Write a protein that binds this ligand. Structure first.
Ligand code: MG
Ligand code: MG
Ligand code: MG
Ligand code: MG
Ligand code: MG
Ligand code: MG
Ligand code: MG
Ligand code: MG
Ligand code: MG
Ligand code: MG
Ligand code: MG
Lengths: 177, 116, 50, 75, 94, 136
RNA sequence: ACUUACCAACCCGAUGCAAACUGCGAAUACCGGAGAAUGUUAUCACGGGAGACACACGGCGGGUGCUAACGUCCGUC
RNA sequence: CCUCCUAAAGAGUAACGGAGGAGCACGAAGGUUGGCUAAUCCUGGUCGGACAUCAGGAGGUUAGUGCAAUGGCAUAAGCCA
RNA sequence: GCCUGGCGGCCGUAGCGCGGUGGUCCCACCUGACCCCAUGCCGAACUCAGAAGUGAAACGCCGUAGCGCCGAUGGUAGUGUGGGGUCUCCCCAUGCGAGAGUAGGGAACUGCCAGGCA
């Protein structure tokens, strides 16, 4: 909830002032935060998914959704419809509280930090990256991990251009390299 | 995508009325306001209609868009049909779930002497 | 074939029975279903799945 | 290694547009709904179309996919 | 600059045109603009030679039909399937 | 030898060779060799005729082949009783109707194209003629 | 990490091929309706007495075979 | 036995003609009510590999249908409860 | 009488495409979500209360011939009937006559009801 208020009073105004937008309903706004864990190797060790799911719960109390293989393909010795990942869709209060759990109490604690890359807006203002080690979230302690497990994060926006994605995050500081 | 999802969800129920020759009670709901009409099996002439955009029963409502408002709309269509002579119909919820306001309009229509 | 014929017996004394099939391997338990007994004129419960 | 075929199922149209039929009379035997049942016409489990009323058969094309529909108007 | 002498057709369809070609003539047609199409019949040998110089397909030709004059351009042409002749030509009142 | 790399079916009803041709103008080069008579071209004939023009022009000039076998011809060998199934595929033909442009050429002077396409006509089972690009 | 007298899908414009491909599409033919003419009722039902189920050729539409057969198998006159 | 085909645009049509299949499956892979939408290019992204998984648009039933072919399929017959 | 909500007719000359657009009323996102209901997770939907903003998204209308679509005429191919030659094919009389393409039309037409602007 802290980051939804801070967005309105200062960022709305600021983002209006880059390209001099005419309407407040045109400024891109951050809509949702989606977490995913690609396990991939759960087909051999069935419990690796079970241990992945509980990881997400402490980051985002929201119980995770499990994503299926869809296409059978022998090219990975897999079945179809067998679980091979998990996801969580964040909106509203938790999304803003989760966003907080990311920059302020994780990023100072990133491994070999010098900033993140800024070229990855797929071309339409949505940002995607990854983290190698999940012990960076403080609901997760070090004495409670059975695995060097990790997870990619992808964000989704209402910006229409790549330029309009960089200005929106810049206004949220966001380290950038 | 928001509007188009509901229209497809309703089509099947509407073809049965076409096969059956049924007279349907059509509801349209919006975040600001709720609407009720009565359309003949041919689909293109309204025998009765009643809604919250009408000044009579609509200013006397706390908000032209709540379950009570839907209930006020519901009450009016049943009787008005009686004022003309139309009485047995079927409810076509037009793809809204049958639930919030939509059920208040239907419940009110049944209470006031309408067979459906 | 590889699917056996069974008889369903009415749980109301009548001597009406239905006939159907069953995968006895994959489905080892006794099948149980309401059916119309034309003698008691009601939907009564039916048992058996040999 | 060949030498096989199937018996013909005698499908096709049995009552054409412009023909007086009773109720229950079969109008078309088909595999899919090449033709669809229109107003006052019914559909059986193998997509056999039959008359639900006494009258004359009428082929029309209606709706956005240009499907053929068969109906019966009473005479 | 080329000037073609033409007569108006009294018949139409496959029989007359095969009969025309049987009579060493061949049909052609004039359409375009607001006025109605004009069915014509042409002498075969004269147009075959004309169109054997590229100028025919890019210049404004003059059709003389019943002693008047219609200004057209060649627009499409049907050639004999495998002999050096012509089955039909389109002209446009451009 | 030209031949379809794959086909849906090995064998084909005899069919007919009615009607007129679609390939009737020179559509790639400047000059063309056009089919007059009606008939079937075997793959071996098309190859023998294709060679004749390439001998004649050295490794100069480009050639397009507008017809393509596409049609399988079967035969029953010697000493076989009638019936008992359709023959084995032996070679491949294309069906030709009058007017089909068979070969085109461009990159030599007209006089040489007529000579070069002509040293081919003696290899074909149907009468042919020399045709040229035409404005429109 | 590069080049590459190689091969080269998709993609695009040009170009033909298809009995088991069709976003087009006839000519006939069949169904059904009404109507004048003509027609030894030619029609339909039921019942009595049979023969018949080795076919040939020609025309056309085709499979087969070699668009071979006084070949061969169907459709139709 | 089934599907397409020759079969000449209603039905049928032949050969030791041309290609394939069936002798099962399902207690839900059945009824109904509510509700749901594929194949594949490009770009971006943890271990991402040409192609496990999240995201963006391009795309529009080529997907899918318990299996042979054909005709059907979006009101879906497809997918879930 | 112009505009927008709703229900159909006709079923691509009704549609994309790009440019512009409108919010008083309607539609629309929308704000809050403790409860009717709700996520194989998430107030995105389903949705209950709501009217502070907002034409930005989409929605509705308009201009627009790059694409689709509609596409004559004249001709060609076929073809039923009769006859004919060179009878693997074509031709003549006759009636029916494509498809693709072409000059061209082309940015829908409507009935109803409701509301808002004269
Ligand atoms: Mg003729
Ligand atoms: Mg026939
Ligand atoms: Mg008699
Ligand atoms: Mg016998
Ligand atoms: Mg005898
Ligand atoms: Mg004989
Ligand atoms: Mg015979
Ligand atoms: Mg047939
Ligand atoms: Mg990639
Ligand atoms: Mg706008
Ligand atoms: Mg035309």
């Amino acid at each position: 909830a802290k980051l939804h208020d801070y967005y309105k009073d200062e960022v709305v105004k600021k983002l209006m002032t880059e390209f001099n937008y005419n309407s407040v309903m045109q400024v891109p706004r951050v809509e949702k935060i989606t977490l995913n864990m690609g396990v991939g190797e759960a087909i051999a060790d069935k419990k690796l998914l079970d241990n992945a799911a509980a990881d997400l719960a402490a980051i985002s109390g929201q119980k995770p959704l499990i994503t299926k293989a869809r296409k059978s393909v022998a090219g990975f010795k897999i079945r179809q419809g067998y679980p091979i990942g998990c996801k969580v869709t964040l909106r509203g209060e938790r999304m803003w509280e989760f966003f907080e759990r990311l920059i302020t109490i994780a990023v100072p604690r990133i491994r070999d930090f010098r900033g993140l890359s800024a070229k990855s807006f797929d071309g339409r203002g949505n940002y995607s990256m990854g983290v190698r080690e999940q012990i960076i979230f403080p609901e997760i302690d070090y004495d409670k991990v059975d695995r060097v497990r990790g997870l990619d994060i992808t964000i989704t926006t209402t910006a229409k251009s790549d330029e309009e994605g960089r200005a929106l995050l810049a206004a949220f500081d966001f380290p950038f390299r | 995508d928001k509007k188009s999802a509901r229209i497809r969800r309703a089509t099947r129920a509407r073809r049965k009325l076409q096969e059956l020759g049924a007279t349907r009670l059509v509801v349209h709901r919006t975040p600001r306001h709720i609407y009720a009409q009565v359309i003949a099996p041919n689909g293109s002439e309204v025998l009765v209609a009643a809604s919250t955009v009408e000044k009579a029963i609509a200013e006397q409502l706390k908000y032209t868009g709540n379950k009570d408002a839907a209930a006020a709309v519901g009450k009016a269509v049943a009787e008005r049909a009686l004022e003309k002579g139309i009485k047995d119909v079927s409810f076509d919820r037009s793809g809204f779930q049958y639930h919030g306001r939509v059920q208040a309009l239907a419940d009110a229509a049944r209470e006031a002497g309408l067979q459906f | 074939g590889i699917r056996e014929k069974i008889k369903l017996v009415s749980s109301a004394g009548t001597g009406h029975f239905y006939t159907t099939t069953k995968n006895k391997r994959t489905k080892p338990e006794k099948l149980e279903l309401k059916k119309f007994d034309p003698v008691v004129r009601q939907h009564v419960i039916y048992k058996e799945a040999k | 290694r060949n030498g096989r075929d199937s018996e013909a199922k005698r499908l096709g149209v049995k009552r054409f547009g412009g023909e007086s039929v009773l109720a229950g009379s079969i109008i078309v035997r088909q595999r899919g709904t090449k033709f669809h049942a229109g107003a006052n016409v019914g559909c059986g489990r193998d997509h056999t179309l039959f008359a639900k009323a006494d009258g004359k058969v009428k082929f029309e094309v209606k709706g956005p996919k240009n499907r053929k529909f068969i109906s019966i108007e009473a005479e | 600059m080329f000037t073609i002498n033409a007569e108006v057709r009294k018949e139409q369809g496959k029989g007359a045109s095969r009969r025309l070609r049987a009579a060493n003539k061949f049909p052609a047609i004039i359409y375009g603009g607001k006025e109605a199409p004009l069915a014509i019949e042409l002498d075969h040998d004269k147009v075959m030679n004309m169109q054997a110089k590229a100028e025919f397909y890019s210049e404004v030709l003059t059709i003389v039909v019943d002693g008047k004059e219609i200004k057209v351009k060649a627009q499409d042409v049907q050639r004999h399937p495998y002999k050096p002749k012509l089955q039909h030509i389109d002209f446009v009142r451009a | 030898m030209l031949q379809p790399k794959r086909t849906k079916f090995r064998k084909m009803h005899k069919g007919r060779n009615r009607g007129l041709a679609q390939g009737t103008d020179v559509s790639f080069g400047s000059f063309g060799l056009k089919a007059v008579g009606r008939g079937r071209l075997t793959a071996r004939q098309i190859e023998a005729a294709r060679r004749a023009m390439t001998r004649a022009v050295k490794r100069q000039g480009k050639i397009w082949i507008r017809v393509f076998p596409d049609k399988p011809i079967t035969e029953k060998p010697l000493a076989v009783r009638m019936g008992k199934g359709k023959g084995n595929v032996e070679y491949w033909v294309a069906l030709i109707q009058p007017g089909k442009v068979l070969y085109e050429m461009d990159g030599v002077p007209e006089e040489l194209a007529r000579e070069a396409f002509k040293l081919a006509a003696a290899k074909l089972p149907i009468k042919t003629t020399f045709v040229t690009k035409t404005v429109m």
